Symmetry: D2
Subunit: 238 residues, 4 copies
């Protein structure tokens, strides 16, 4: 009924909303967090990037809820003698949303409690164990209004290898499914849970990414998006 | 390579940029020009509406030019004892473009001379003969940087009948083709000419509509867009 | 409940049903009529190998569809063109009928309510007994006498790009042709009731013929073809 | 240079090649194995009627493709499941091989470099001589002994949604299954060199079998199916 789709193999700032440290490089890579002139990622970085047009997720007249899917390739790399931190996430957020706290909160939250007014749904690729809320192994998590994921799966993170993600949402079943594959390693990971978008999100949202680097020396990473495809469909009744 | 598409059967202001008199009605119709509380169109109206995300039309590094296509249904209706004026157009314009002069200039031009800095490509559905530049019969016209169309075809306009338009641009041949059908009348019209987008338009544009009503009593119309689908593709080299 | 699409920039025999003189060249072109220079009295048809459901008697639903194709009709010097080519919807298993001006679709020029034929013709030869005098695009329903035509300013050897669309909500069949090198364009539209003409399942494809009389001959080459159908279209998406 | 896609929410025989016990029910379901309650020693296969080009020897190009489908495997009380179902790519004209645990695709459990078979199996029965002990999703290349498996927590009568993707630029075949009612998900991935296994043109579809021994039986119903391939994919577009 209403349908939107886009697909980019290279990025440009013109059709993106970039926040904080997010940049588009001369190679057309979406570099969510800061990288210095030496090619090295820096500490206490936070950036977010969204598609410039809002996307309708649900309709309060008809009660319809969109189905959507997104795919993207990302590269998280780590300097020798550091470990990675903190990760990146694909997000659906209110129009006008501004960055929240950095580090392990991923620019999405101000603390680690549930916040029913966060209006945040995200799929996180978390590279740093945060003792107060995370499982110990690195993980893909489904986040609904909290940094404490409603569901996670173990992610065997490998630095500098391109990761291909597919996230799908089927509004008939309310199932959100996230998967990651490393084509060069032939490894694959998947997590799934139900999410009630209509109870969490505004009718219109912005879609895109958030990422942070570690705040403590020895915990840092690049957070580069290399390609992105999104599609959504919302029924109108004809 | 870069791809964008969207399709709406009903409209909402959230993902549109609306200028001047353009509104979205409670029925989700995009009403480009003013209609009063009696359902009657008013004189000296001008409105424009665009998709909120800019669209890349060409790339100055690779030299690639997008191919695109758009379809839409419109309804132009006229009160008894008036004739129609002035028409509507599908447009590609610079990001940030503001309305120009009203009436026969369609909110796109300031006079009827060629302006090499207008950066305007439009397909017009012109319901009012303007003696200084138009063919006498109502017409579909291809407009490049001037209200004086580079090419026109006769359009047998009928008030209040839904018109379905398809406009296509093939960057390999540079051919722009515009067609209109009235499904209820079984009539159809087509016009085609080449346009060099790279020489006329900026690399990024906004896509959408402009419309005006007559400035003189007895020349007035509604200019309602009822549905709109757009798709573009720009090669990146992989 | 049902969607089908395909698009070919180069052809191969494996997924086509080829009839009579229709060949796939080694350069990937679908040459519907014979080339030894084209020859006389040729008939060729070509279809996609999977049947397409266009309507359903249990639900009443009728498909919307669209097809685009590029064709090249060329003519030898000291000859004129004949007879033309058509895009067709036919019953599963259909066999070629009569040659020449009947385009391989009919036995005679009278209406036949058992032909189960819907076609869009690109007619290069004036047949005194049924055609308009100028060369034409026509919508054919169970007869070689088109229900609707438009004038087509045929030019030999120029690539022609066709778009045909059918909207089941309005019953409107629209056919357009452009010559991108010449910047010329043509369009014809009329309603067709598919429910009452075609069987529930059809084969989609092409038919073409050359003239049976010396001096009236042409090539009938299809260079690319896309098709899409939906049964319970986005024309901006399809056209691209 | 070549694209093909279809999507069915309801099935019909007209555009399918059905083999052995495979039927289309009157409610539009593709029941791959026999239901009198499912019965023993059943084998059924079903294919799309048009051949799909997966690679080309003149250009070297290999297709990328994706397929999604919903299936329901159900089991009678006082019975366990067997033997499973698979999505397959096979040579044009392929005929059913042996029943039971060989899923209608092989004669024995040894590697056969002439089977020209690429399959994704949903294996419901532990075959002592080649399978892992838990029920599994497997990638089969010219053998019933999967090159790669993942554990599948099979649950009877629950709709399962499958996505299979092949990326010709990485050679990676990925297969995932979700049970939306249970919120469970499974994934397996491995590289497959299609060029060296399959002929240039293939038929795509399904195979399924029931157990040959009392107490090991199941239905193998496909409820919907979408396929897309491209030969010179957008997974966000396809999945939707
Ligand atoms: C309490 C905690 O999680 N501490 C980790 C620290 O978190 C930051 C901040 O990112 C987080 O949002 C906030 C929540 O209140 O707490 C702190 O301010 O981040 C550092 C890395 O920058 C972690 O330290 C590293 O942890 C690794 C865990 O595997 C490993 O032990 C490293 O050696 C260590 O430096 C804090 O654990
Ligand atoms: C000169 C001219 O075109 N005049 C028509 C007038 O145009 C406006 C304005 O819209 C236009 O952009 C500008 C260009 O310099 O000129 C004028 O300011 O618009 C009116 C209608 O509002 C036309 O009058 C109507 O024309 C009809 C032509 O078929 C018909 O004659 C009507 O009876 C008449 O009122 C001016 O012709
Ligand atoms: C009567 C007529 O149409 N003559 C033209 C001729 O047509 C052929 C054939 O193509 C037609 O299908 C049948 C229908 O009766 O008639 C003739 O046999 O084709 C010639 C070129 O091949 C034209 O010059 C004739 O005018
Ligand atoms: C040896 C074995 O696998 N036994 C199981 C049996 O398998 C069948 C058949 O399905 C296999 O394809 C062939 C391969 O040699 O062996 C047997 O004939 O299936 C039973 C259920 O039908 C299992 O209980 C046996 O364990
Ligand atoms: C994006 O495109 C614009 C052209 O409008 C150009 O000015 C800008 O430098 C581009 N950015 C990058 C990172 O290439
Ligand atoms: C469009 O949607 C928004 C919901 O954010 C609503 O406030 C607004 O009234 C809608 N406009 C129309 C014309 O329906
Ligand atoms: C069609 O495909 C087969 C390979 O399967 C091959 O023999 C033939 O050359 C192909 N035809 C063309 C025109 O490429
Ligand atoms: C398949 O189509 C034919 C009509 O062409 C019909 O006889 C049959 O009922 C259809 N099958 C189903 C399951 O609808
Ligand atoms: Ca963390
Ligand atoms: Ca005018
Ligand atoms: Ca004729
Ligand atoms: Ca087994
Ligand atoms: Mn986490
Ligand atoms: Mn004009
Ligand atoms: Mn004719
Ligand atoms: Mn197995």
């Amino acid at each position: 009924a209403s349908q939107t789709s886009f697909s980019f193999q290279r990025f440009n700032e013109t059709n993106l909303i970039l926040q904080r440290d997010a940049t588009v490089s001369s190679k057309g890579q979406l570099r969510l967090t800061n990288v210095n002139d030496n090619g090295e990622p820096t500490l206490s970085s936070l950036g977010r990037a969204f598609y410039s047009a809002p996307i309708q997720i649900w309709d309060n007249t008809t009660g319809a809820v969109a189905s959507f899917a997104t795919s993207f390739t990302f590269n998280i790399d780590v300097p020798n003698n550091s470990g990675p931190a903190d990760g990146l996430a694909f997000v659906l957020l209110p129009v006008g949303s501004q960055p929240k706290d950095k580090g392990g909160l991923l620019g999405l939250f101000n603390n680690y409690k549930y916040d029913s007014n966060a209006h945040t749904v995200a799929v996180e690729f978390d590279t740093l164990y945060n003792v107060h809320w995370d499982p110990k192994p690195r993980h893909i998590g489904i986040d609904v209004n909290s940094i404490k994921s409603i569901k996670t799966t173990t992610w065997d993170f490998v630095k500098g290898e391109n990761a291909e993600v597919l996230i799908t949402y089927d509004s008939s079943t309310k199932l959100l499914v996230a998967s990651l594959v490393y084509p060069s390693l032939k490894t694959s990971f998947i997590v799934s849970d139900t999410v009630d978008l209509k109870s969490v999100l505004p009718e219109w949202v912005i879609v895109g990414f958030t990422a942070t680097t570690g705040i403590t020396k020895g915990n840092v990473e690049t957070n580069d998006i290399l390609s992105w495809s999104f599609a959504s469909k919302l029924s109108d009744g004809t």
